[PDB]
Design a binder for this molecule. Sequence first.
Ligand SMILES: NC(=O)c1cc[n+](CCCn2ccnc2/C=N/O)cc1
Ligand SMILES: NC(=O)c1cc[n+](CCCn2ccnc2/C=N/O)cc1
Lengths: 540, 540
Amino acid sequence: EDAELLVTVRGGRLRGIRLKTPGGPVSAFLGIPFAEPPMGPRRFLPPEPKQPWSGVVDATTFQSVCYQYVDTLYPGFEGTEMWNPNRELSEDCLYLNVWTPYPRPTSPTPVLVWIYGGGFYSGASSLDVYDGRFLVQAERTVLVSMNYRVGAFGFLALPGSREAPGNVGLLDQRLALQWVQENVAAFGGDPTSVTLFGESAGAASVGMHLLSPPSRGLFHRAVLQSGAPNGPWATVGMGEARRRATQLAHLVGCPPGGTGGNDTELVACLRTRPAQVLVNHEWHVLPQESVFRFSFVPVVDGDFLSDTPEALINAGDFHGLQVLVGVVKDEGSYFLVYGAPGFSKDNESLISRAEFLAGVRVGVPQVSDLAAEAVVLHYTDWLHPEDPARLREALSDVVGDHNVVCPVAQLAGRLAAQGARVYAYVFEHRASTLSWPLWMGVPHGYEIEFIFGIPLDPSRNYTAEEKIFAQRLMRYWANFARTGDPNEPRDPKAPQWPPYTAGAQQYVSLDLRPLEVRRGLRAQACAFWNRFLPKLLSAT
Amino acid sequence: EDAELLVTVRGGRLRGIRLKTPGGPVSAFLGIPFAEPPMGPRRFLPPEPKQPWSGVVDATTFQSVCYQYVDTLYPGFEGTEMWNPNRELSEDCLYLNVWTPYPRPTSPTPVLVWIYGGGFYSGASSLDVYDGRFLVQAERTVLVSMNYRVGAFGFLALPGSREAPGNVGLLDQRLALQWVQENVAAFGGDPTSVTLFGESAGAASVGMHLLSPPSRGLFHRAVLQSGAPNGPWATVGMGEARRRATQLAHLVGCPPGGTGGNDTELVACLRTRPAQVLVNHEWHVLPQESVFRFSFVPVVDGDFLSDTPEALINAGDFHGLQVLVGVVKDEGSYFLVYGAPGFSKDNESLISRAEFLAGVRVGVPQVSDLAAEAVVLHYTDWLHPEDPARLREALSDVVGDHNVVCPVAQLAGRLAAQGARVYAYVFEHRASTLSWPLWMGVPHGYEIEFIFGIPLDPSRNYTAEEKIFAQRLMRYWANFARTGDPNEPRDPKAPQWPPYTAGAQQYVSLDLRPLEVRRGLRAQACAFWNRFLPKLLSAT
Ligand SMILES: NC(=O)c1cc[n+](CCCn2ccnc2/C=N/O)cc1
Ligand SMILES: NC(=O)c1cc[n+](CCCn2ccnc2/C=N/O)cc1
């Protein structure tokens, strides 16, 4: 009887499961409860710690996925299904997972904590692509990941109200971080060495925890993959959050005709609706046809965030912090088939100039005509203004730069200039197994499978070079979690990864070739997004 | 084994299964192949008869559903999922079903042949709501139902070409009718007394078989429930069919740029695509925003239909034919939550005037502004031009009259005036169990469960009166199948159902109350759609 699969934590006892990898076993504790189930009167409220239990909680399998929209744009297609729920939906979903090496470490060990993305409306810690076994086996760190509420359940906000304050999904994540502080030692993990990493909305979440004092004490380093809290999609204002919550209420019959609509009556009516009914009307509250925009996201209300992420990033002192940040080569391409005219995943998407110009308004919603003209100016090649392949790549750059690359470059420079040690990458390898079309390149999200070492899975069909590549990346991430520095403390031979500075703006390319040092994260394009375009809006 | 579960037909031997009902058993032969699988090079081609087979084909369960779009507007909702595929999808789907009384009839028995609807893009003979057991037990009829190809697989058409001539789904249905002629006697059925019945696109199908000489000899009576072949959604012109097939081809990368163009190359490239890839782009070829319009429907090309259904209906000689036709009380309401602004199944859908005016353009697509104005004039109550509930009901009337009621009334009068004996009904009972909101009333499709006797299913929660009502309706349908006359052959007690005539236009209400005779199928509204609005379009 393997005793390493039995563990006690502050709330009670647990039984885990042994997971195999080609390099040897790992111990996993899947489905640990960290909150009271946020159901009934608790819908929309901050999470409450899980009261202790008697007996042995089974932690041999993932728990339920939090209620969420399910992507049906392409039934049966691996490229989208890999992100969809792979356990039943439930509002009873606040559970977390721990992978720990075997044998259990005897000395405290650095902890990696994964926060999944999914635009704040989807995602689950149980997805096959977030399987922590290969990372824990290869680098002998401890890995934690949590579920947190998404969509209306995590982020519906009637600002000011007690009944739906907003941001409860971010509090779910915080509660889990408090849980790691109090219990990760029982797994051999070092609560004084906790590195958050996250992708897309999970990166925005990691960043929001940097900027929230109650969370900032629960971790020591940060990794932000393809996302940032200052993204145009990552936060929303009090007025717009209240409008979205109120329209959601209207769409599900709340409040009943002739009844008052103050915040208490509205949330109470919302709390009587079946969860799926809320899910089914979520996309219908966005103010305009768009891509890369999500209905229920963190709200800037003075509580979890005392000011906007932009204000807090500018004023912040980040001495003592190490950050790893990065982007994939083609951040925008994946979003174009969700609404840009002329795009299809099943053809070459060779759009016309008219389609490009309409696409700019979908990819940059809610901006004046003069602003759109400025976008078209910067992104047209005026020697080939109607070449469809260039227009396709250009709209991909518009969406990616506006939503990911330039918010990230912005954050990276302000952090580096104000005290933090920053490392930056661009991920340029396209999986040999990628099922999206070739024209999308390296889409948003397709470095994750390499960070988690999925190529080592013997049941998959990756190449031998991709396995070596994956091991390289896991070493980088674990080095950063251990020491604050992705460079090997022992290999002065291997090419080095220099820090990112607001001046030299150096970053490395991650692909099958050895590291290559480059300068500037699309500096010219991001000067347009970050410096000029705002001034353009002020003078309307 | 029971002897009567074993049957031989022209192609080989079958084993059926015994189905229970509260009144006694029935013998069912589910999943009989009637065509060669229309796969590979046979995709888009007319069906070929199923070659005979060795041994016993198992006919104990339903076979596969033809590839089709799956409704995701409301995940988990009974009201939509009752229509979704309940067997796996396959291009190998040309199977039919035979229910027969136990014990097997010894003298030839009248045959009812069900053709399902689903807008020509969806549907299956296996759906629970088409369970033929209660009709066959209660009325000792033989019941047949077939699968036929839908969507692009049944109705993509490059007119003229041999590679994709169109209407092959209608040819599937005909092959099944030829099969009933050659084999139904083996089940105790009388091939000289075959009554086709069908709902929505199945009723349009039944109507198309009336107007096609090769089909017309395969049957003797017709029931058209909530649909007609002259409906604005039920057929499409050669040019528009070619445009839709070509855009579908484009959306899936056919032809590979820039090689290709002619119909042979286009269809060959389409035949190499996974079926699901075609399904995934089906809705993106419709010319504009609309409700009650479908991409791939029967094409008027001079072959299956030598002329438009309207022309053939007007010229036709229908002596010797008996027809039953009818509509539900609220033909339009279902469709409004699929596109009309302001509508939602989860609220009261109390639309504003603005929404109603925009809805008219969605419900009456591709008409001039002046035509839309005429629709608004006819459908506004000018004493209450802004009352939300009246506007909600008015747009429902707009969609239902235009798409169903007035095409049916038109067909009914031309048939009766030109030699057919016609009976007409309006179905006015709203199921006690109906899951759609109360404001939708008696939606499109919700008489089917009463015609098939589903209230007798003891695992369901219908009322005692709905069971009696169901039995009364099954009597009418079977009486009409046996004698051509829904009226009880001798019973003078029960109130009488008088024929529909182009002069008196009498019809009956079907609900829990005894029959009531009424005159005029929305005569004033249908005069607007059938007589005036065409003249308004002629002078643009
Ligand atoms: N209008 C719809 O029915 C609808 C369908 C799918 N979606 C999924 C949105 C996916 N998406 C768009 C931009 N970015 C994303 C996902 N990022 O993870 C949204 C709305
Ligand atoms: N791909 C899409 O977003 C989509 C668009 C329209 N539809 C139409 C749904 C079905 N429908 C609309 C009008 N009438 C019907 C069904 N009639 O049976 C489905 C999917």
